[PDB]
Amino acid sequence: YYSRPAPRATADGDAQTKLGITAVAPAQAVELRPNFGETELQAVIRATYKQLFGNTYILEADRVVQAESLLRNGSINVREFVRLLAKSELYKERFFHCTSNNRFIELTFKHLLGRAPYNQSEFVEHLDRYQKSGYDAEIDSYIDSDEYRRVFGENTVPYFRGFKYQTGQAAGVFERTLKLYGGDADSDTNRNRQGQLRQVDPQELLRSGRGIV
Amino acid sequence: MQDAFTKAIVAADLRGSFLSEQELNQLTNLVKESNKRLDAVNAITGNAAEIISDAAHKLFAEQTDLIRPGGNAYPNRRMAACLRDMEIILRYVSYALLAGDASVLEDRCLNGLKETYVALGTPTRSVARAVQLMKETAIGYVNSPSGVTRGDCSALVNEAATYFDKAAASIA
Amino acid sequence: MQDAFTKAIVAADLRGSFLSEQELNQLTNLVKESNKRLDAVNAITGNAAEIISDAAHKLFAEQTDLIRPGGNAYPNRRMAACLRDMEIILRYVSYALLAGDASVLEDRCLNGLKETYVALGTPTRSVARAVQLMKETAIGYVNSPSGVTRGDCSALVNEAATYFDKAAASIA
Amino acid sequence: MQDAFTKAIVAADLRGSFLSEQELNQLTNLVKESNKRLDAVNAITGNAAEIISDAAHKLFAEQTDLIRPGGNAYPNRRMAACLRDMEIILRYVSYALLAGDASVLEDRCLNGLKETYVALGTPTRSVARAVQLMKETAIGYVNSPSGVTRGDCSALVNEAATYFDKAAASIA
Amino acid sequence: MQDAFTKAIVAADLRGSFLSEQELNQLTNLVKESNKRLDAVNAITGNAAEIISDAAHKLFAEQTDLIRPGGNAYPNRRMAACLRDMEIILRYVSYALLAGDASVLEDRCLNGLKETYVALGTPTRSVARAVQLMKETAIGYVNSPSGVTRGDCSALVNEAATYFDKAAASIA
Amino acid sequence: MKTVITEVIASADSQGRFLNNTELQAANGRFQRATASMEAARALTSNADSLVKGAVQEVYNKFPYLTQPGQMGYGDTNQAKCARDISHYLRFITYSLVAGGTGPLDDYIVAGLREVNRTFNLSPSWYIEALKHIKGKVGSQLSGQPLTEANAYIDYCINALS
Amino acid sequence: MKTVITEVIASADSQGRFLNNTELQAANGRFQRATASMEAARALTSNADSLVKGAVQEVYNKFPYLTQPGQMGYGDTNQAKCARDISHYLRFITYSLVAGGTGPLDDYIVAGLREVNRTFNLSPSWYIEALKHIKGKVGSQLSGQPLTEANAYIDYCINALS
Amino acid sequence: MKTVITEVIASADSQGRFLNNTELQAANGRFQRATASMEAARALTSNADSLVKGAVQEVYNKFPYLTQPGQMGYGDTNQAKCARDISHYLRFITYSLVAGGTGPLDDYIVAGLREVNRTFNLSPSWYIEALKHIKGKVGSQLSGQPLTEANAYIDYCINALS
Ligand SMILES: *[C@H](C)[C@H]1/C(=C/c2[nH]c(/C=C3N=C(/C=C4\NC(=O)C(CC)=C4C)C(C)=C\3CCC(=O)O)c(CCC(=O)O)c2C)NC(=O)[C@@H]1C
Ligand SMILES: *[C@H](C)[C@H]1/C(=C/c2[nH]c(/C=C3N=C(/C=C4\NC(=O)C(CC)=C4C)C(C)=C\3CCC(=O)O)c(CCC(=O)O)c2C)NC(=O)[C@@H]1C
Ligand SMILES: *[C@H](C)[C@H]1/C(=C/c2[nH]c(/C=C3N=C(/C=C4\NC(=O)C(CC)=C4C)C(C)=C\3CCC(=O)O)c(CCC(=O)O)c2C)NC(=O)[C@@H]1C
Ligand SMILES: *[C@H](C)[C@H]1/C(=C/c2[nH]c(/C=C3N=C(/C=C4\NC(=O)C(CC)=C4C)C(C)=C\3CCC(=O)O)c(CCC(=O)O)c2C)NC(=O)[C@@H]1C
Ligand SMILES: *[C@H](C)[C@H]1/C(=C/c2[nH]c(/C=C3N=C(/C=C4\NC(=O)C(CC)=C4C)C(C)=C\3CCC(=O)O)c(CCC(=O)O)c2C)NC(=O)[C@@H]1C
Ligand SMILES: *[C@H](C)[C@H]1/C(=C/c2[nH]c(/C=C3N=C(/C=C4\NC(=O)C(CC)=C4C)C(C)=C\3CCC(=O)O)c(CCC(=O)O)c2C)NC(=O)[C@@H]1C
Ligand SMILES: *[C@H](C)[C@H]1/C(=C/c2[nH]c(/C=C3N=C(/C=C4\NC(=O)C(CC)=C4C)C(C)=C\3CCC(=O)O)c(CCC(=O)O)c2C)NC(=O)[C@@H]1C
Numbered sequence A: 001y002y003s004r005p006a007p008r009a010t011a012d013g014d015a016q017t018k019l020g021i022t023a024v025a026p027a028q029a030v031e032l033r034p035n036f037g038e039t040e041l042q043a044v045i046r047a048t049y050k051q052l053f054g055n056t057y058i059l060e061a062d063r064v065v066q067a068e069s070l071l072r073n074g075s076i077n078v079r080e081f082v083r084l085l086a087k088s089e090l091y092k093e094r095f096f097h098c099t100s101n102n103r104f105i106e107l108t109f110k111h112l113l114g115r116a117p118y119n120q121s122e123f124v125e126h127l128d129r130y131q132k133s134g135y136d137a138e139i140d141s142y143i144d145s146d147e148y149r150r151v152f153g154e155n156t157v158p159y160f161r162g163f164k165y166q167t168g169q170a171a172g173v174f175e176r177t178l179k180l181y182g183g184d185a186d187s188d189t190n191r192n193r194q195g196q197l198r199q200v201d202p203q204e205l206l207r208s209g210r211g212i213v
Numbered sequence B, C, D, E: 001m002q003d004a005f006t007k008a009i010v011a012a013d014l015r016g017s018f019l020s021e022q023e024l025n026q027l028t029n030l031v032k033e034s035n036k037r038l039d040a041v042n043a044i045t046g047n048a049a050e051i052i053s054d055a056a057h058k059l060f061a062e063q064t065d066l067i068r069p070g071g072n073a074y075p076n077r078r079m080a081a082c083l084r085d086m087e088i089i090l091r092y093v094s095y096a097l098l099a100g101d102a103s104v105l106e107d108r109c110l111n112g113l114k115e116t117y118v119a120l121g122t123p124t125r126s127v128a129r130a131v132q133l134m135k136e137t138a139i140g141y142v143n144s145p146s147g148v149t150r151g152d153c154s155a156l157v158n159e160a161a162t163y164f165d166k167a168a169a170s171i172a
Numbered sequence F, G, H: 001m002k003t004v005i006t007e008v009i010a011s012a013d014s015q016g017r018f019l020n021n022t023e024l025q026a027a028n029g030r031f032q033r034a035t036a037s038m039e040a041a042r043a044l045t046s047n048a049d050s051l052v053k054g055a056v057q058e059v060y061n062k063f064p065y066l067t068q069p070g071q072m073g074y075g076d077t078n079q080a081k082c083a084r085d086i087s088h089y090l091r092f093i094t095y096s097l098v099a100g101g102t103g104p105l106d107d108y109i110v111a112g113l114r115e116v117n118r119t120f121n122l123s124p125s126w127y128i129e130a131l132k133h134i135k136g137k138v139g140s141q142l143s144g145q146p147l148t149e150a151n152a153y154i155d156y157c158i159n160a161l162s
């Protein structure tokens, strides 16, 4: 009696595999170590490029050789490597110049922290930041922020934190990130028909609190 | 965020007006109850672990299938999640109770919870049930403490209920 | 991104052909106007602060309620947001004007703008209004400068207008 | 992830039971074929580069327009992406073949692919074609190796096919 | 970073003064040479690939051990690095040449380069050599173009040299 | 909005923990104080108007030239505004007292203060005087803790303005 | 420091690419312009002083009350400062013309402008007048492109100040 | 697409600022140069064909064995392709001149160049010759700046190919 196939009889994996989030859910974390083999280096590099650029395809010409060398000497940590990629023509061309600032913020949020944006205020602090100071100062505020430091603070490639309960999460990340992720073959792409557009609808943000400012 | 005080303010602001004397008297009295309010919260926090433990036992006695192979609370990993969730909801409820306002609870905790549960395939109904089971146990403590000055806590008790219920409803 | 030149190229590319001589003559002419074009831009940038300041004053004289409690430009932070936005739009417009193409404006700025405004509860109508108010003031400067060689800027002036208007329309 | 073994387990689990003796004998047999299975994989991997190279040539001979200005495989950048896609698909197929299960292929590789292709405007039909072209060439090698002990690989060959086809279908 | 103009400014600033007329005349004349300056740069950039290719060949003909097992340019991986490095240095040199100032090259590349090379076990000597080999080839082009207006480039040529040499020295 | 109560919740929430004794202690503090705070608010609310008149006025004495034609202080519209504004400051300081935190002040007034003021060429100085003059008057109608509270908040703005 | 030349180098460097035709075109633009720019600088440099006197002065006319005792414009120290400052602004503008970018202006004058001004209670307005008055005078000694250039930079500050 | 004009916009945009003098200077450069650029394009466009024939041809002289049976140069299909390709390269070079930036070249030709070439076993060398031969011919029909421009771009590819 206490052992009997339940009538639902869904597997453990089932719930993830049905959504297509099976790889990202408890994502694996890639760390660069104090002395690195030639393969660890090349894993880290592949993982960064895949996560920052959103599984969009980076050719052989697109790669940035210098940043990778500095990463090989030990002269920059992985966290610095991430900033160099993020502050780069190639990133800016894909997720910044073609989209709207509302679209970019949600992208960078996803790229540099696997979650989607928790609420409407997150858009206010990051849009005003951008008018006051550069793009660059904005990008820094992400890597500089404590949440980036607290998880994957140094020598760890950023990984999706969405799709798993994180402390101080808002509800309705889960759904929001599902709008952003959309499967292992999907990729956000500057160059698709109808351009680069926000998936996260603006009314669901307000659904989480909206204070004054 | 928001709470009882802040809220009343905001209202007042849109009228563009100083606070009504009547309105002050809401807050004035709200203050007076503070001490009661606090003890209420304290009681929950103090008994937290238990509240859950209890509720769970009852939940699983009722819906045997959850813990059967293929059910939603099986295997361990899932079970763990389910416990974790209960706790969270509780945590928020408490928060609200102190604030004297649902908001905090609605925004961080409830809003979009349903949809999550749907996508996962977790049965919303059962979740709701658990929340109630919790409710009852919790009130149990709020209402029957030791070493507190005896008096009437009903007002608070009911508000507590409401919070639990908003939870139950929105999840369900 | 894109601009007048690049655009024509792209078109040509899909046909698979060298640029038509006719088409060159569009660009050839475009070059000739450059100097005018530039000064136009320069005029906007030079007067930027003012342009906005002005437009705002007028906007608020008209729609008194925006600045009243309950309106959208109240309180301070909202007013600041509103000012900031106006400026941005302007910034882009200028960009376009130099490029000789709407694109930059459409893609960075206009795309999604309406819906944002909606979600927030910002009244799109008023936004549009502000854009126009700006338009007129801006043209004012473009068209009446000091120390510049006298000639006809109309062609540029109109294109400027169009940009402003695309803005107004898509927001509205 | 999943594979033949793991899968059978999971099935067994939902029934709530130890593995049927009958069911073991599926796996027992599966093991025996291993060696064949392996060589199959080895053959693909060994010839990878070529498989693709080949398939491509044929694909472009057929669908001339892809490589014409305005088509999907033009210019270089695009062409490169298309080769690369072909490789990825192949890679997965191989993986599956070893696992003895489609899953890996469906989840990592095919999942989302259609929609992507749509958004890009890439013509799904042609993609499917390419996959087949690959299929045939690949089987070619699997089935005609050198220095391997002679025997019957059909069973494996067909399963290989199926994988390719799941691919073709889901893309298309 | 810095360049000829900026530099002079900065100096002037610390004195607290407007630019001396004498000092202007440095810049005035610097401008005049621009055209020459530019073509110089253009020549390097145009021939880049070659410059390196060449220098390398010569470098390895001389120091055969670098390419032998146990040497520093072996195996492939290392060789690649070595080529890459040469190029970089070149790139920076060019930059300087345009700026009309050493600063950019030294700060971005040279400052710390020696020590790196040391820690790795790269023989700084050889690196320096390569830089020179490059120098000569490069000058070769700068100084012998076709279809440029004939005149004297010496002044620029020498400055070019110096840059190369700062490189050679700091590395060595 | 930042009040005592909201903050402790926030902090508790971030760490992912239940409200324990630590936070309640803090809360308690807010509630005990309230009695004084509340009193102060009742006092300001009542004399509002009079405070406002006095302030506006003051400003003009302090900066005569404002009332001259072609200036900002000149012509009724502006005077009306000037009044309004100070009334807004007055209502919000009262809100803060009651809310038991700077919160109301911060987002409603302090946020974006600078840029607003820059774009419309409102000189902080003015406001300040207004406030000071107020502070002085309040320094009669109130006493003891009630007073102290009133000050705190009034100042908080002075500092934000400057 | 941002000048045309520095920027293209920077951009080239970031991408990790040689300076190609694209950038040189840009450079060419600068240096062609320089001839006009340089001229303008020679003109400002020479009349510096006179421009400064005139400006400082102007400000006082515009804001009489400043010269009254107990104000900022009052007492020589302050006048000296006021002079100094205006001269500094002019010096950066001259530098920028020569450098061929806003660079010099941005780093000396603009960055931190606000907070300085806030903490010492310098009203932007003043500076502005100074500049405007200047602009007007410059609008005589110069003409054509030289003039245009001078303006651009002068304005750039007006905008930054406001 | 990278042209002078797009870049300055981009740079302006990143910093979040209006186009100031700095950028316009740069733009100006692009426009003045255009006249030469444009001329060059008209010249290449006209002689296209002839250049192409000559090039293709050259390649074969340079690498006789290609025309032998069982090789890549052999059989008309391949020759047709070879023609096509060189013609494509020429069209992009003309496009760049007009656009006033490498942009067009980068995106069509360069990006993905390597891998394409690898997978189909096209030897860069070939293309190169084609180009060189071209460069030589162009070195007659053009002169002065027009020429210089043409070269720059042609080379840019040589470098990318190698
Ligand atoms: C227990 C009473 C019931 C139950 C719970 C349950 N939940 C999950 C999985 C998740 N639960 C959440 C929920 C939250 N995310 C939030 O942000 C909040 C508060 C705002 C909650 C409460 C999430 C995100 C997950 C998925 C990720 C994770 O594991 O952390 C499961 C497991 C289902 C799965 O496949 O993941 C379960 C079982 N379900 C029951 O059976 C009980 C009735
Ligand atoms: C209500 C569910 C229960 C109850 C409560 C009750 N409490 C009091 C009085 C006080 N309770 C507290 C508790 C705190 N004050 C604080 O500052 C903190 C945080 C550190 C706590 C935990 C205090 C200090 C008082 C005042 C002194 C006292 O103990 O009485 C009362 C008395 C009525 C009042 O308004 O104060 C009551 C009724 N009584 C019930 O019926 C339930 C058991
Ligand atoms: C001013 C004329 C009107 C006004 C504006 C207003 N806007 C917001 C909020 C936002 N506006 C935007 C604008 C943009 N997003 C972009 O990406 C771009 C282009 C780069 C623009 C121009 C965005 C992002 C927001 C949200 C973030 C924020 O809050 O700043 C508000 C505030 C709304 C609120 O309730 O929070 C306002 C007031 N509103 C008016 O009343 C004027 C008519
Ligand atoms: C048009 C809105 C108004 C106007 C413009 C105008 N400008 C010129 C000529 C020139 N203007 C410039 C301006 C620039 N060129 C640059 O390189 C830059 C940035 C560094 C600017 C600001 C230049 C250099 C010229 C040429 C020389 C000159 O000043 O004459 C004209 C004349 C037409 C022509 O250039 O062929 C005109 C009409 N003047 C008006 O009347 C309009 C109100
Ligand atoms: C080639 C046989 C056919 C073809 C394919 C094609 N694909 C793209 C672009 C993309 N393809 C993918 C797909 C994947 N990403 C993955 O990770 C996987 C496996 C898990 C796949 C299969 C993606 C994401 C892109 C975008 C890449 C990017 O943005 O850099 C193109 C290029 C289209 C474009 O405009 O970029 C092409 C051509 N299309 C054909 O015409 C062939 C028949
Ligand atoms: C099938 C497509 C073709 C074929 C295969 C075939 N292979 C064997 C036997 C073996 N092949 C291997 C290969 C491996 N074993 C390993 O451990 C590894 C990885 C390190 C490899 C590559 C081995 C070890 C064996 C056993 C000895 C042997 O090679 O003969 C058979 C024989 C049947 C059997 O082993 O049960 C066959 C048929 N032969 C063909 O002609 C098919 C087209
Ligand atoms: C070639 C002429 C000689 C040579 C070079 C060589 N270098 C390395 C390793 C590195 N090269 C560099 C240099 C730079 N990286 C940068 O970012 C810059 C600009 C600031 C430079 C100039 C660095 C720092 C490394 C390490 C990172 C990497 O490997 O990419 C090697 C390989 C040695 C090793 O163990 O890494 C070599 C061979 N040495 C020779 O033999 C030639 C004489």
Ligand SMILES: *[C@H](C)[C@H]1/C(=C/c2[nH]c(/C=C3N=C(/C=C4\NC(=O)C(CC)=C4C)C(C)=C\3CCC(=O)O)c(CCC(=O)O)c2C)NC(=O)[C@@H]1C
Pocket (backbone or CB within 6 Å): E032, E033, E034, E035, E036, E038, E039, E040, E042, E142, E143, E144, E145, E148, E149, E150, E151, E152, E153, E156, G024, G025, G028, H033, H144, H145, H148
């Ligand atoms: C010096 C290393 C060799 C040389 C150079 C040289 N150049 C000129 C004149 C010019 N050079 C240019 C070139 C450019 N101007 C630009 O704007 C750009 C980038 C887009 C370049 C590359 C120009 C335009 C001129 C002006 C006249 C012309 O038609 O070239 C000279 C003549 C002196 C002068 O400065 O005008 C010289 C000597 N020629 C040699 O023989 C040297 C070996």
Ligand SMILES: *[C@H](C)[C@H]1/C(=C/c2[nH]c(/C=C3N=C(/C=C4\NC(=O)C(CC)=C4C)C(C)=C\3CCC(=O)O)c(CCC(=O)O)c2C)NC(=O)[C@@H]1C
Pocket (backbone or CB within 6 Å): C057, C060, C067, C074, C075, C076, C079, F059, F066, F072, F073, F074, F077, F078, F079, F081, F082, F083, F085, F088, F108, F109, F116, F120, F122, F126, F127, F130
């Ligand atoms: C009083 C010391 C001086 C004065 C005031 C005055 N104010 C304005 C314009 C504005 N006043 C404010 C201030 C606020 N509005 C808010 O929403 C808040 C926060 C709740 C405050 C503090 C605002 C925002 C404006 C600008 C737009 C508007 O019209 O509301 C003016 C008009 C200036 C102008 O139109 O440019 C004046 C004159 N008047 C005096 O006599 C004193 C010098």
Ligand SMILES: *[C@H](C)[C@H]1/C(=C/c2[nH]c(/C=C3N=C(/C=C4\NC(=O)C(CC)=C4C)C(C)=C\3CCC(=O)O)c(CCC(=O)O)c2C)NC(=O)[C@@H]1C
Pocket (backbone or CB within 6 Å): G059, G066, G072, G073, G074, G078, G079, G081, G082, G083, G085, G088, G089, G108, G109, G116, G120, G122, G126, G127, G130
């Ligand atoms: C002139 C219109 C008015 C005036 C001005 C005045 N300024 C100060 C003090 C400072 N002014 C500045 C400005 C600058 N210092 C710099 O280094 C730069 C950038 C190059 C600038 C623009 C600064 C920084 C100060 C602070 C202290 C100092 O003297 O350096 C005063 C003194 C005010 C005080 O209390 O500190 C005055 C009066 N003087 C007048 O008469 C006009 C009203």
Ligand SMILES: *[C@H](C)[C@H]1/C(=C/c2[nH]c(/C=C3N=C(/C=C4\NC(=O)C(CC)=C4C)C(C)=C\3CCC(=O)O)c(CCC(=O)O)c2C)NC(=O)[C@@H]1C
Pocket (backbone or CB within 6 Å): D057, D060, D067, D074, D075, D076, D079, H059, H066, H072, H073, H074, H078, H079, H081, H082, H083, H085, H088, H089, H108, H109, H116, H120, H122, H126, H127, H130
């Ligand atoms: C000419 C020097 C030699 C030659 C060429 C040749 N090319 C191919 C195949 C391709 N050539 C290209 C080139 C381009 N197509 C583009 O879209 C672009 C960017 C605008 C370029 C540069 C491409 C992409 C292909 C591959 C696909 C196709 O068929 O077009 C071949 C055929 C190789 C094959 O394997 O089929 C040949 C032979 N022919 C000669 O005679 C010279 C040796």
